[PDB]
Write a protein that binds this DNA or RNA. Structure first.
Ligand SMILES: Nc1ncnc2c1ncn2[C@@H]1O[C@H](COP(=O)(O)OP(=O)(O)OP(=O)(O)O)[C@@H](O)[C@H]1O
Ligand SMILES: [K+]
Ligand SMILES: [K+]
Ligand SMILES: [K+]
Ligand SMILES: [Mg+2]
Ligand SMILES: [Mg+2]
Ligand SMILES: [Mg+2]
Ligand SMILES: [Mg+2]
Ligand SMILES: [Mg+2]
Ligand SMILES: [Mg+2]
Ligand SMILES: [Mg+2]
Ligand SMILES: [Mg+2]
Ligand SMILES: [Mg+2]
Ligand SMILES: [Mg+2]
Ligand SMILES: [Mg+2]
Ligand SMILES: [Mg+2]
Ligand SMILES: [Mg+2]
Ligand SMILES: [Mg+2]
Ligand SMILES: [Mg+2]
Ligand SMILES: [Mg+2]
Ligand SMILES: [Mg+2]
Ligand SMILES: [Mg+2]
Ligand SMILES: [Mg+2]
Lengths: 110, 131, 113, 380, 108, 47, 78, 50, 157
RNA sequence: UUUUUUUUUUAAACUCCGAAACAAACAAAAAGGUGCGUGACGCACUCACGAGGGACUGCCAGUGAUAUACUGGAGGAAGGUGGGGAUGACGUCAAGUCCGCAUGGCCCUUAUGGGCUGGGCCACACACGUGCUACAAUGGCAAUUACAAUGGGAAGCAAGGCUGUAAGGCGGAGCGAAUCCGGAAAGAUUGCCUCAGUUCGGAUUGUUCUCUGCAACUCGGGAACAUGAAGUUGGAAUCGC
């Protein structure tokens, strides 16, 4: 089922499968399913009215490709204002005060 | 043995620290505790309940003992004064529970008398006969 | 009777780095004698003034406390207090508790009942 | 599969000789076959009531209790122990049902006690005796099922929380044995049944109520609740109200795992965009219809400690103060009868049976039936 | 005290305080070595340590009380080692080491 | 019932009386206050 | 209330009296916050050695002054 | 999951509290709601728990 | 006595049987966590104990079929490493047999992915009819001992 | 359940008389179930504190040079150094420390001295050492339910209670403390997950906040939600017990 801007698997339970949506994690999936009056069920076992209700509940949260574009535009705003975090983002460097002497391997490569 | 004269028995506590070296001040000097049995105050049940609500956990139900400790003043005699002033204030506020009970009891009786179809005719006759 | 003294009394708490039983002649006369559990504070310092981190010397500061109960009456309290202010317990700081009883004057609160 | 085969052949060879059916001190181990559960007296205490598993599942179509299933899977025999506590409970409800021509009987009883003392088996045997006497019994062997799983929707009229799938399961479990009796019992309430939210389908369009036909019986009401998912909760509530108005047969409500109705349920309510609030079991419509004991119906609710309910108040809400009753564990004589039974059913070897050994097992288990049945194979 | 097999731990029944079966077996072993099961009403108070330490302490107290009731029972209790106090306690951590005995990683 | 009203009405109004007797600080809305920094000891001379 | 942060953003005391008149000259105060009234002004922010020139725009409001004057030279290995 | 700050183990590792760990007030509120009591009931409760 | 207090309380054992139970419980205990492994061993005991028969004697006979009479050791002579056969002591025989049984059971769990009690009972049953991976390990060790039997008298122990 | 034999005992309260008509339970006394305590007696017991005893191959048997010893055994809480600590010879490494301090000599004296603000000691193609968290089912998570010891507390610890999803905010029962003050976790019970780069693992990053502080940009701690790297047990080699 296409929920938000992602494919929720049919064979998985919905509380696990709703976390495939960008912007929805473990807490928000439980919150949305609590708003639907559902404990847990398979995604293919949803009724139609449950699908309109599910797409309405996810719509109350910023999610999907517009949230991805918002995060990208915030990072690009930091880059284009040329603050210190923007210079760390542009140079491929950690921007939360971590050391670069030994352990910046995630921000760098292998 | 018990104290002289008459009245409920107070039970004071005081501490003196004898530190060497000519600097006699210590943080334990000023604290004064006063204890009393609530049953010896002659309060009613409503007054005792209002006292228990005002006091909270300074009252111990197993010993029926009210303990007031004062440490917020700089000297021992000021805290000894403050304990007794607090005791008089708590007794003065707890004594008001009789008037509240009387007021709501007569309010209950008057509200119930209005829910009676045989009383209003006599009441109206008595307030018309004298105007 | 071995029961607890619960009345007018003077309680003495003596705190020292040494045992007061070493000099028991300077203790005030008492009705009961009790001891608190010992309390220590551990200090671990480096032995060298420069880099020898695995070499440590450990010190302690052990606290000792004793409790003394003196049964008294209300009239013999200031007389006992005068001499208690002038004692000399060897290497110690002593602590006087006073438990005294008065009677409550209910004449300004009897009207409010 | 040859491990169980030898014991199966030995047990098949044991039943041909009736002299092996012995208990402590030469007593007969089993009750006579002519005796039913209504004919059990004090001379049958310590003996064994043989069942037929097909007949037992016919009398109890809601499902056997897990303790009964465990004991039957370990003993390889459909038999249960006749204890004094079960006879006392049966005599209590018998004196309530009909007074004989100063011990005051209690209409509402909560079976409490230590864990694995035999509360579920006593409740199931009580339901078997009541259905042997032809009583209208609503039996819930898994009361935790009423508060866990499925869907939950908030009622727009009463404020409670509706569970439609559990309601239709309750109705099906009731009708599975009470189909012959509910056809002959007329409804005494003729108000229309208010429709609610269905299981994943929302409200029914255009229809708010289902009227009750004049000739409709209790079977028709139960089938109305079963067939429609928008009315199952309201039909459960109406069935609770109708069970108090039945005057032809005695009505018994038997709820196992009864302490799950005094704790939280599985369901949570979003009360804040960042928070969820757990919903108590007392807020469920079926439980709120069925939990209370402040009435005049014969209701028995057995607690369970294997489920992780935890600690509740000694003074339970909506319960009379004298309703709680202590169901004890095995005594010495019951433990001796149980160990001789396990010797008969070949759970232990004959060469390693002694008084000291079973007394060791009894004092180690402290009367725990499951631990005792687990410790008999380890007897040397 | 002589009785019918009662066993209370901290004003609770002992299968509630010690629900594990091996703890109760270790508790009831000194009674089974002297063949006096079901003849005692034992009330005990235990504090400190963990569960197996409390079980061992109650076992030692039971053995000592059984010896105090009848000194002729000492032979079976001394043969099983129940009257020996287990003196093994937690060894203190030493400075310059990670634990009591475990050292820091040494560069070769 | 009358008994519940009697037991309930005698314990009302005791918040302001308690704060007056014991000299407490009353902050019913619970906003940030300078009370917590003005209730600690000055330590400047000690240092 | 309307405020989402209970604490005011920090500004040094020399910027609190003459306001934008202090922002046409050298600034050592990297810990101050760039206010919305500081837009369309040019500042020279000390980085430790030199005063780095910065032009205040709309996107610099709410940042510290020291975020636009880097203190360590971006460095390369031979 | 001792390194995961969104879990109870990680918050215990960091010595902090939150939604996953919760202070003792959360236990007090949960046991007051479980026993069907008002939240103004003083702790410890004046009831016997069995 | 510290391990399997239930078996010691219902004591009809000897020293070898108690040591076998203690080694079966203790060999796969990690991080000082006994209860789960002991429960697995208890259920493995319980599976044939509910069908009459003596499980303790069965496991004594099962360990005996895995006990290695001879083992091999690595001895370096003149810069070239040899393989010297040697005699296995009885405690080491029991330890090696129980170690091989537990290795076979846990590798069977990681291969077939069923309950560990099932794998333990299956491998002890395979040991009871002189087959299975533990019997193959014993056969391989005996073959390695008999193959390098000419390198004996290089022994030192 | 009855048959006897032997010994003791015979104003209150009615369903009665007289009333109330408004429910009450009221200034204490008057009933039945309970929950949490307390006093008196004590200090048997645990524990605390002071002083002691006990273990010395003392006894027995054997091997052996009858010696010193060694191997077992009894008794005992403990047996052979009972466990652990402290205690560290002559000298060696011209070992380390003039940047803890003190010191001989040399050197600076509008500076190599003193102050402030700002920066740096937190950089980053890489290499090495010490750790933490993991790669999972001998597990992850949720609910329920148990059991510690060491220490700390006035620039403080802060019970109950109110507010916030939370970190926090308000307020303050007691405590300068064997008195008062902080849910031990693994464990166990129940349930979900079912071998997946996953309900494993939480790096990186965004947004919104909060605490401390004159001040959190470089460069602090913490919360909420989201983001979801590598990693599927590690070569030669090497560490601890
Ligand atoms: N009358 C009986 N006849 C035979 N076995 C019995 C009897 N009563 C109890 N048992 C044994 O004790 C076990 C526990 O019984 P049961 O399941 O009824 O316990 P419970 O008291 O309801 O406990 P729980 O707190 O776990 O719900 C049974 O599985 C069975 O082995
Ligand atoms: K850095
Ligand atoms: K010695
Ligand atoms: K910062
Ligand atoms: Mg202290
Ligand atoms: Mg049950
Ligand atoms: Mg340790
Ligand atoms: Mg220690
Ligand atoms: Mg995780
Ligand atoms: Mg609090
Ligand atoms: Mg709250
Ligand atoms: Mg004594
Ligand atoms: Mg010896
Ligand atoms: Mg040198
Ligand atoms: Mg050097
Ligand atoms: Mg400076
Ligand atoms: Mg105060
Ligand atoms: Mg766990
Ligand atoms: Mg489990
Ligand atoms: Mg994951
Ligand atoms: Mg911050
Ligand atoms: Mg990978
Ligand atoms: Mg894997």
């Amino acid at each position: 089922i296409r929920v938000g801007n992602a494919e929720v698997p049919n064979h998985k339970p919905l509380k696990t499968g709703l976390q495939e949506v960008y912007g929805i994690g473990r807490r928000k999936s439980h919150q949305v399913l609590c708003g639907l009056g559902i404990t847990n069920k398979l995604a293919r076992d949803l009724t139609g009215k449950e699908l309109i209700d599910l797409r309405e509940e996810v719509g109350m949260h910023q999610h999907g490709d517009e949230l991805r574009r918002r995060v990208g535009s915030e990072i690009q705003r930091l880059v284009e204002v040329d603050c210190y975090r923007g210079s760390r983002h542009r140079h491929g460097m950690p921007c939360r005060g971590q050391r670069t002497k030994t352990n910046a391997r995630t921000k760098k490569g292998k | 043995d018990d104290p002289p004269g008459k009245g409920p028995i107070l039970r004071w506590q005081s501490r003196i620290v004898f530190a060497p070296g000519g600097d006699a001040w210590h943080p334990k000097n000023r604290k004064v505790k006063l204890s009393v049995t609530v049953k010896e105050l002659g309060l009613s049940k409503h007054q005792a309940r209002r006292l228990r609500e005002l006091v909270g956990k300074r009252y111990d139900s197993g010993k029926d003992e009210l303990t007031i400790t004062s440490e917020r003043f700089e000297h021992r005699e000021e805290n000894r004064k403050d304990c007794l002033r607090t005791l008089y204030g708590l007794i003065e506020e707890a004594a008001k529970a009789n008037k509240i009970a009387e007021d709501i009891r007569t309010a209950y009786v008057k509200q119930r008398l209005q829910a009676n179809p045989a009383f209003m005719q006599k009441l109206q006759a008595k307030i018309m006969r004298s105007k | 009777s071995t029961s607890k003294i619960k009345g007018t009394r003077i309680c003495i708490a003596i705190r020292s780095f040494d045992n007061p039983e070493k000099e028991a002649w300077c203790l005030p006369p008492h009705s009961r004698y009790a001891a608190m559990p010992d309390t220590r504070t551990l200090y671990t310092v480096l032995r060298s003034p420069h880099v020898d981190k695995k070499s440590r010397e450990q010190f302690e500061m052990r606290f000792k406390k004793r409790f003394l109960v003196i049964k008294a009456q209300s009239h013999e309290l200031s007389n006992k207090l005068f001499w208690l202010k002038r004692y000399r317990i060897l290497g110690a700081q002593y602590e006087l508790q006073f438990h005294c009883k008065t009677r409550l004057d209910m004449s300004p609160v009897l009207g409010s009942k | 599969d040859d491990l169980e085969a030898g014991r199966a052949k030995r047990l098949a060879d044991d039943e041909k000789t009736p002299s092996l059916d012995v208990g402590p001190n030469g007593r007969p181990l089993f009750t006579p076959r002519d005796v039913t559960l209504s004919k059990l007296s004090q001379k049958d205490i310590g003996s064994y009531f043989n069942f037929d598993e097909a007949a037992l599942k016919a009398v109890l179509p809601e499902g056997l209790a897990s303790g009964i299933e465990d004991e039957f899977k370990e003993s390889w025999r459909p038999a249960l122990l006749v204890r004094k506590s079960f006879l006392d409970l049966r005599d209590n409800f018998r004196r309530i049902a009909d007074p004989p021509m100063g011990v005051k009987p209690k209409k509402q009883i909560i079976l409490d006690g230590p864990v694995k003392s035999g509360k579920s088996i006593a409740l199931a045997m009580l339901v078997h005796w009541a259905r042997d006497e032809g009583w209208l019994v609503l039996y819930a062997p898994k009361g935790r099922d009423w508060t866990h799983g499925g869907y939950f929707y908030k009622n727009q009229h009463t404020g409670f929380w509706d569970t439609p799938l559990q309601a239709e399961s309750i109705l099906k479990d009731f009708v599975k044995f009470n189909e012959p009796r509910l056809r002959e019992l007329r409804c005494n309430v003729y108000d229309p049944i208010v429709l609610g939210e269905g299981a994943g389908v929302g409200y029914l369009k255009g229809q708010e109520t289902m009227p009750i036909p004049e000739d409709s019986t209790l079977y028709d009401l139960v089938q109305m609740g079963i067939n429609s998912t928008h009315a199952a909760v309201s039909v459960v509530v109406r069935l609770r109200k109708e069970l108090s108005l039945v005057k032809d047969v005695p009505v018994l409500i038997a709820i196992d795992q009864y302490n799950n109705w005094f704790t939280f349920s599985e369901f949570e309510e979003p009360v804040t965009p960042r928070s969820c609030r757990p919903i108590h079991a007392r807020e469920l419509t079926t439980v709120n219809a069925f939990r209370s004991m402040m009435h005049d119906d014969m209701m028995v609710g057995a607690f369970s400690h294997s489920t992780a309910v935890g600690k509740l108040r000694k003074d339970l809400p909506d319960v009379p103060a004298d309703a709680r009753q202590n169901f004890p564990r095995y005594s010495l004589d019951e433990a001796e009868a149980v160990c001789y039974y396990y010797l008969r059913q070949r759970l232990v070897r004959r060469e390693v049976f002694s008084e000291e050994n079973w007394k060791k097992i009894y004092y180690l288990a402290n009367g725990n039936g499951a631990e005792m049945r687990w410790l008999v194979p380890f007897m040397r | 005290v002589p009785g019918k097999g009662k066993f209370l731990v901290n004003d609770k029944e002992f299968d509630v305080y010690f629900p594990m079966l091996d703890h109760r077996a270790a508790l009831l072993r000194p009674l089974a070595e002297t063949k006096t099961l079901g003849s005692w009403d034992i009330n005990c108070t235990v504090t400190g340590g963990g569960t197996t330490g409390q079980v061992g302490a109650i076992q030692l107290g039971i053995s000592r009380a059984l010896q105090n009731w009848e000194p002729d029972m000492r032979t079976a209790l001394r043969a099983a080692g129940f009257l020996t106090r287990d003196s093994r306690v937690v060894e203190r951590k030493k400075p310059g080491k990670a634990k009591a005995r475990k050292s820091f990683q040494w560069v070769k | 019932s009358l008994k519940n009203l009697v037991t309930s009405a005698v314990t009302v109004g005791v918040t302001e009386a308690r704060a007056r007797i014991f000299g407490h600080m009353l902050n019913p809305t619970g906003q940030r206050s300078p009370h917590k920094i003005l209730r600690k000891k000055l330590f400047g001379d000690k240092v | 209330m309307s405020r989402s942060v209970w604490k005011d953003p920090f500004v040094d005391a020399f910027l609190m009296k003459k306001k934008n008149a202090a922002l046409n000259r050298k600034i050592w105060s990297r810990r101050s916050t760039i206010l919305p009234e500081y837009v369309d002004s040019a500042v020279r922010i000390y980085n430790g050695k030199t005063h780095v020139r910065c032009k205040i725009t709309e996107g610099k409001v709410g940042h510290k002054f020291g975020e636009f004057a880097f203190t360590r030279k971006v460095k390369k290995h031979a | 999951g001792r390194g995961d700050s969104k879990t109870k183990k990680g918050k215990r590792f960091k010595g902090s509290y939150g939604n996953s760990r919760g202070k003792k007030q959360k236990m007090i509120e949960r046991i007051k709601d479980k026993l069907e009591l008002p939240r103004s009931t003083p702790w410890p409760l004046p009831f016997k728990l069995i | 006595x510290x391990x399997x207090x239930x078996x010691x309380x219902x004591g009809g054992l000897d020293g070898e049987q108690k040591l076998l139970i203690k080694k079966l419980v203790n060999f796969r205990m990690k991080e000082g966590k006994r209860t789960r492994v002991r429960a697995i061993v208890y259920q493995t005991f319980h599976r044939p104990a509910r069908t009459e028969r003596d499980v303790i004697k069965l496991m004594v006979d099962a360990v005996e079929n895995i006990k290695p009479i001879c083992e091999v050791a690595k001895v370096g002579v003149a810069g070239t490493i040899y393989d010297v056969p040697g005699i296995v002591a009885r405690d080491r025989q029991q330890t090696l047999a129980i170690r091989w049984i537990l290795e076979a059971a846990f590798k069977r769990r990681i291969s077939y992915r069923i309950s560990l009690e099932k794998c333990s009972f299956a491998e002890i049953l395979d040991a009871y009819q002189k087959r299975g991976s533990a019997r193959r390990k014993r056969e391989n060790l005996h073959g390695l001992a008999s193959t390098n039997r000419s390198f004996a008298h290089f022994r030192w122990w």
